[PDB]
Amino acid sequence: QTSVSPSKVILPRGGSVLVTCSTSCDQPKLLGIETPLPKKELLLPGNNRKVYELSNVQEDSQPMCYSNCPDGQSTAKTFLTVYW
Amino acid sequence: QTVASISSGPKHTQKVPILTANETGATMPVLPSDSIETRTTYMHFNGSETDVECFLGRAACVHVTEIQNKDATGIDNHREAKLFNDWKINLSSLVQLRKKLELFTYVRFDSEYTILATASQPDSANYSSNLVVQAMYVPPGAPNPKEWDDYTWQSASNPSVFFKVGDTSRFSVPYVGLASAYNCFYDGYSHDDAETQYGITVLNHMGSMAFRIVNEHDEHKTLVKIRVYHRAKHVEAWIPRAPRALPYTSIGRTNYPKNTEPVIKKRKGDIKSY
Amino acid sequence: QTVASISSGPKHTQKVPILTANETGATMPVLPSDSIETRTTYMHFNGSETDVECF
Amino acid sequence: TFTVINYYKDAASTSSAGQSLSMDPSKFTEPVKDLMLKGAP
Amino acid sequence: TFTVINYYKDAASTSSAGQSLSMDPSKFTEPVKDLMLKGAP
Amino acid sequence: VQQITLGNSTITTQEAANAVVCYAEWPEYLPDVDASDVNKTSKPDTSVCRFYTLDSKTWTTGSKGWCWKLPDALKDMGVFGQNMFFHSLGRSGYTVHVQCNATKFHSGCLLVVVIPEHQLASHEGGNVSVKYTFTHPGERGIDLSSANEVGGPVKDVIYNMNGTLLGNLLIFPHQFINLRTNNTATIVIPYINSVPIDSMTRHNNVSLMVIPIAPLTVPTGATPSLPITVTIAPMCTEFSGIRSKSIVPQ
Amino acid sequence: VQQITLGNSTITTQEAANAVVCYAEWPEYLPDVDASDVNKTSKPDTSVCRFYTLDSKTWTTGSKGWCWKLPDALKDMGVFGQNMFFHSLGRSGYTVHVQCNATKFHSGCLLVVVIPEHQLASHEGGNVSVKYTFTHPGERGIDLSSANEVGGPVKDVIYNMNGTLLGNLLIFPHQFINLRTNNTATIVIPYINSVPIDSMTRHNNVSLMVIPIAPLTVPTGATPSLPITVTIAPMCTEFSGIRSKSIVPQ
Amino acid sequence: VQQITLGNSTITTQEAANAVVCYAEWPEYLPDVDASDVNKTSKPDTSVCRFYTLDSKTWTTGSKGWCWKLPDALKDMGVFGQNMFFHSLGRSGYTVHVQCNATKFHSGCLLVVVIPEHQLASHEGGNVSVKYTFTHPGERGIDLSSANEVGGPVKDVIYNMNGTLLGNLLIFPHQFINLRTNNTATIVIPYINSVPIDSMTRHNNVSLMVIPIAPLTVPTGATPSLPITVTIAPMCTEFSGIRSKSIVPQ
């Protein structure tokens, strides 16, 4: 099943956070994170895990990791909160 | 010779071809000969350059990545060190090509790839290395290499091309879509689920390319920039579409950024100005 | 056997039999076969009891 | 005036196909049909 | 649609042969024979 | 006049209703040469080939337009909806009949357009997706004049909800409902897809957009609205892979 | 051996399954000469002509029997049920397949019988009626060994729930499932009615009764029960008068 | 019924014994076009073409299986063994007849499979070899349920003693002995080798594996074993290069 780390994070307004998407499938075809934030895929080897630096978080957002893996839930949402 | 215009004199026609009803959704082929007296001219023109094969059919740079040849001893993340790099093949990352392709809903083509490798040695170097690049086409969903000298590179099945830096490789890939054509637009989901991704689909998986420098390290670091050029050939296109007006924001989505600038130019003057 | 209804399939008729003008004072004989797809049935009926002699 | 030999066994290897002769825009410009001539199957 | 000239004298030098047309899995899927019809030599 | 009778349904039009057949292609059953799925297809009778009328929209002076997605809009329509839910695969054409009558004193122009693969844009930007519930609204469709929702599509009719300009939407099969000229529009849609048949639930083959181009101008003192009614009939519908009824969200 | 494949369904029987065709009449579509309703009938595809398996009953040493009413038992079965609810009129034949396997050590005999117009008696006497909910139980049917209910039918299998003796039920189309001989029974039922077509909801054309005649005697130490499974396929089914879905009680 | 009479031997089977002929190829004598050795081959008479019965194995509830290698298993069988030892070269087909009878109360399933070039794995790992004495056991064969020996093969039936999974062994010519269905299995093996003829002593052309797949479940109170008997007849056997009798270890 698709997984996101962290499950939840509280971060300062405008800061960056690293969100990890992972699958149980070893070889997923689609794996990413859906978010309106500016993001940067960290150079990381492998197919079933990705890390994104979601930059300049301004509001409460719910970035969703997605995949095409058919085991379990193919999507996982994380909850970003801003404090200011 | 194909006639462009026929000779036509005064007309007191009761079958008015210039009065129609656009409410019907048809563009009736009204010609100059219908509203003005015309002479007879010839086309002298076949329209060879407007055929979809030519319109969508020259090589365009669709990916650029830099990889390095350096001492790999004592590095955990080779991908981060840019010892190798992989890329899920897509023709959406360059906007000129994307807009041209997005003029159609379904597109079917074979792919001709040209990979150009160019070396640079910014730091002090005594000479220019004779480096060899391995460009490995990995089939859709196949495992990408995880380290620079992983055994995935020695795959007995993945197509690989070895070429010198500074030179090019060229190889064609047939149309590899599951369906009869690529879905440049997909108004659906992979399955009936409340949270699943919209639009982006596995139907349009064209494969992936992994790149490394085969050579072991020299005393200096060499930076290699790999440019992948894609040329579509044997192109078939269906269902013309409204051209893209707004900037893109992501691959596989029709999203556009918030607060975009107006597309339609404002007139310098009123509606009567020329 | 007298036919009551004839088999009739989809109709994209331009001679609309269901639009008329009762202003004329005629009851145009519009049949079920004109507004719905019908099967073929038979009357099995002469109308002997509606003849004025019996009525 | 022009010559091509196929050097590879795959159709994907051949050069571009050229021009689609039979081009007709009525598919897009004149898609109107009267539905009272029963053109529908 | 396709052309090959043999440039070398050896059969081992030729490119791959292509596809074996006459493919039939009954060798492996239907190897059963009644031994009472005397099929044995 | 014109009359179209499908099954137990009939639409009469006192306008000389000229129909647009998308790309001059009539709906057709999947031929053998194009078929991949091996199961014998289920070709329903009168029970599905009939006109289903959706609930009417009100066209006001400031309404942006409406969007329906097929076959989603008919998922709850009599026998067709049931078959769409009980089968794994399905393909269908459509006869769309958009109706909007007014007087000779009204002015306004609707653009009725059918967009194959009308992938909607999200109003949030980045790579956010439009959620299933918003792209499968049902017979109510999407009202472009309402406000944005979390996970909903963008609703600026100028950009067709997809980043293309409205003026260019005439490249798709369309008809105008010009209140001075006509009150009905008829578009016959064939099955359009890269695959010969597909899942009717997770994928919307076409989108029907009814967009006011020339705004509604009612005569002085008149009620400032007109009802727009959409009537659809499945055509050459096929179903394959019957099984337990699918479970979709909403 | 025998195999019957209907649509995407198949029943295989390693018994030489001989079928009883009630009154030597195959199910048939209503001919023109017999038709009264004028509407073109809806003749479903593979979608309905297929085997529906009902939930299995347990045959114990003291079980009296079970009764199903058609088409009531199939009112919730895939596409057939939906069509039965959406149409005003319907007629259908049936292929009933009753299955009950045991070992060569078991003994017992089931009477599988099809009764047209099996009007049930009320256990209260006088002129009391059996309520709709009891004569339309659905796929569960009526268990003759349960207790009486207010408004339910009488449940003495000796009298067939109608005041006739059990021994005489062989005048109807029937097959025995004799555990020593056979494990399956097949009866093909044509449409039987005084009217050419009828409402499928308010009227049950036939009743399927599975009655233990010779009681189940399991071998020593064996579990004292056997499952009985009923499989039914609608045959030559027609529907007419599509409209809003009917509302029935329960 | 069936009867196969070879020389002075006869096997009768009251089962309709259907024989598997490996790869639909009957044993045949080496044709001239394929021959390399120039000597006129010795084609024995009835003396060798006959059924040799090996000593029976006992199939218990926890037995893993047995493996015989040909022609090794017949090296001590009458005239065939002598000829195999006196000649330098030899090729032969085989008719293998595996026999295992039980009652209608027993359950269990043997996989009888013929593996050409069944190179055994050593249980020690690395690059250790299985010694000659273990790969040439004779008529006793290899019992997969016994313990490992120094220089012996690995004996985990799940991996076929070669690193491949048991489930996949059906790619080779095989028959099941399903105690409910049949009690005998017959496989006709042709000569399989990259060379037209070979030394019968140092190389085993095929391996016969009899593997319990579904374990033996005897009825309550029954003896928890069944005998399995293997009967083999050389077919189209040829010998070439007669000389002094070979000396092999054990």
- Residue B259 sits at the vertex; the CA angle it makes with B254 and B262, to the nearest 5 degrees, is 85
Pairing outcome for strands B60-69 and B222-240: antiparallel
Residue F213 to residue B7: CA distance in whole angstroms = 39
Check CB contact of D40 with chain C, cutoff 8 Å: yes
In angstroms, the separation between the Cα of residue F124 and the nearest Cα of chain A is 6
- The sign of the CA dihedral F157, F162, F168, F169 is negative
Q: Which residues of B touch A62 (CB under 8 A)?
A: none
For G231, other C-beta atoms within 10 Å of its C-beta total 18
Check CB contact of E39 with chain H, cutoff 8 Å: yes
Residue H239 to residue H85: CA distance in whole angstroms = 10
Q: Which residues of D touch E18 (CB under 8 A)?
A: 9
**Phi and psi for G72 in degrees, rounded to 5?**
-55, -40
E strands in chain H: 2-6, 9-13, 19-21, 52-53, 57-60, 66-70, 87-99, 107-116, 142-143, 174-178, 184-189, 206-217, 225-242
Tokens of D36: 């009272």
Q: Between the CA of residue B101 and those of B93, B183, F212, F222, G165, what are the distances in Å?
A: 12, 11, 29, 48, 80
Q: Which residues of D touch E3 (CB under 8 A)?
A: 5-7
| AA identity, residue F207 | S
Q: Tell me whether residues B202 and A30 touch, CB distance under 8 A.
A: yes
Collect all residues with Cβ–Cβ distance below 8 Å to D9 and sequence separation of at least 6: E2, E18
Q: Where are the alpha helices (DSSP H) in B30-88?
A: 52-55
CB H118 within 8 A of CB H162: yes
The residue behind tokens 């990889």 is B67
The residue behind tokens 């009717």 is F200
3-state DSSP percent of chain G in helix, strand and coil, to 5: 10, 40, 50
Q: Residue A1's domain spans which residues?
A: 1-84
The experimental resolution of this structure, in angstroms, equals: 2.4
- The β-bridge partners of B233 are B110
Touch of G by C (3+ CB pairs closer than 8 Å):
yes
Tokens of B31: 């010609």
Residue D28 to residue B12: CA distance in whole angstroms = 30
Residue A20 to residue A50: CA distance in whole angstroms = 6
- Round to the nearest angstrom and report the end-to-end CA distance of chain A: 35
Longest dimension (CA), chain E: 55
Instruction: For domain G2-242, give the fold.
Output: Jelly Rolls (2.60.120)
- The β-bridge partners of B162 are B134
Chains in contact with H via at least 3 Cβ–Cβ pairs below 8 Å? E
Tokens of A8: 């939840």
Collect all residues with Cβ–Cβ distance below 8 Å to B14 and sequence separation of at least 6: none
Q: Tell me which chain D residue has its CA closest to the CA of residue F21.
A: D31
The residue behind tokens 């020259």 is B58
Check CB contact of D12 with chain E, cutoff 8 Å: no
Residue H200 to residue H195: CA distance in whole angstroms = 12
DSSP string, C3-53: EEE--B--EEESS-TT---GGG-------GGGTS-B--EE------SSSTT
* Interface D-E: count of C-beta contacts within 8 A: 9
User: What are B149-153's contacts with CB under 8 Å, separation 24+?
Assistant: B149/B72, B152/B210, B153/B210, B153/B212
Name the residue ranges covered by the structural domains of chain H.
2-242
- The β-bridge partners of B115 are B169, B228
Q: Tell me which chain F residue has its CA closest to the CA of residue C34.
A: F5
Q: Between the CA of residue H182 and those of B180, G82, H98, H102, what are the distances in Å?
A: 50, 48, 11, 9
* Interface B-D: count of C-beta contacts within 8 A: 52
Tokens of G133: 């909910």
In angstroms, the separation between the Cα of residue B195 and the nearest Cα of chain A is 7
Helix (H) or strand (E) holding H78: helix H78-86
Collect all residues with Cβ–Cβ distance below 8 Å to H242 and sequence separation of at least 6: H42, H86, H87, H88
Check CB contact of D5 with chain E, cutoff 8 Å: yes
| Count of structural domains within chain A | 1
Q: Tell me which chain F residue has its CA closest to the CA of residue C19.
A: F12
Out of E27, E32, E39, closest to residue H26 by CB = E39
Longest dimension (CA), chain G: 62
Q: Tell me whether residues H188 and E40 touch, CB distance under 8 A.
A: yes
In angstroms, the separation between the Cα of residue F16 and the nearest Cα of chain C is 9
Pairing outcome for strands E32-33 and H87-99: unpaired
DSSP string, chain F: -EEEEETTEEEEESS--PEEEGGG----PPPGGG----SPPB---TTTSS-EEPPPEEEETT---EEEEETGGGTTSHHHHHHHHHEEEEEEEEEEEEE----TT-EEEEEEEEEET-PPPBTT-TTPPPPHHHH---TT-EETTS---TTPBP--GGGTTTTB-GGGGGGSSEEEEETTT-SEEEEEE----SSSSB-TTTB--EEEEEEEEEEEEPPTTS-SEEEEEEEEEEEEEEEEEE-SPP----
CB A70 within 8 A of CB A79: no
In angstroms, the separation between the Cα of residue F133 and the nearest Cα of chain B is 7
Chains in contact with A via at least 3 Cβ–Cβ pairs below 8 Å? B, F
Residue H164 to residue B93: CA distance in whole angstroms = 46
Touch of D by B (3+ CB pairs closer than 8 Å):
yes
Check CB contact of D10 with chain E, cutoff 8 Å: no
| AA identity, residue G23 | Y
Pairing outcome for strands F184-189 and F87-99: antiparallel
Q: Where are the alpha helices (DSSP H) in G87-205?
A: 132-135
In angstroms, the separation between the Cα of residue E31 and the nearest Cα of chain H is 5
Of residues B184, B95, B107, B244, the one with CA closest to residue F160: B244
Of residues B213, B252, B21, the one with CA closest to residue B117: B213
Tokens of H15: 């089962």
| AA identity, residue B84 | F
Of residues H45, H173, H193, the one with CA closest to residue H114: H173
Residue F213 to residue F231: CA distance in whole angstroms = 21
| AA identity, residue H153 | P
Task: Give the sheet arrangement for strand G107-116, strand by strand.
Answer: G142-143, G66-70, G206-217, G107-116, G174-178
- Round to the nearest angstrom and report the end-to-end CA distance of chain E: 47
DSSP string, F57-101: EEEETT---EEEEETGGGTTSHHHHHHHHHEEEEEEEEEEEEE--
DSSP string, H149-182: -TTPBP--GGGTTTTS-GGGGGGSSEEEEETTT-
- The sign of the CA dihedral F196, F202, F203, F207 is positive
The residue behind tokens 């259908």 is G92
Q: Which residues of F touch A52 (CB under 8 A)?
A: none
What's CA B149's distance to the chain center, in Å?
31
CB A1 within 8 A of CB A69: yes
Of residues B207, B88, B213, the one with CA closest to residue B149: B213
Residue to test with chain B: of D2, D10, D19, most B Cβ within 10 A? D19
Tokens of B173: 């890939």
Q: Where are the alpha helices (DSSP H) in chain B?
A: 52-55, 95-101
Residue B14 to residue C46: CA distance in whole angstroms = 57
Q: Tell me which chain H residue has its CA closest to the CA of residue E31.
A: H24
Of residues B108, B111, B97, the one with CA closest to residue B60: B97
Residue B180 to residue H222: CA distance in whole angstroms = 63
DSSP string, B96-141: HHHHHHTTEEEEEEEEEEEEEEEEE--S--SS----EEEEEEEPTT
Helix (H) or strand (E) holding G116: strand G107-116
For B133, other C-beta atoms within 10 Å of its C-beta total 25
**Phi and psi for B34 in degrees, rounded to 5?**
-95, -25
Residue G72 to residue G92: CA distance in whole angstroms = 12
Collect all residues with Cβ–Cβ distance below 8 Å to A60 and sequence separation of at least 6: A79, A80, A81, A82
DSSP string, A40-66: -B-----SSEEEEEE----S-B--EEE
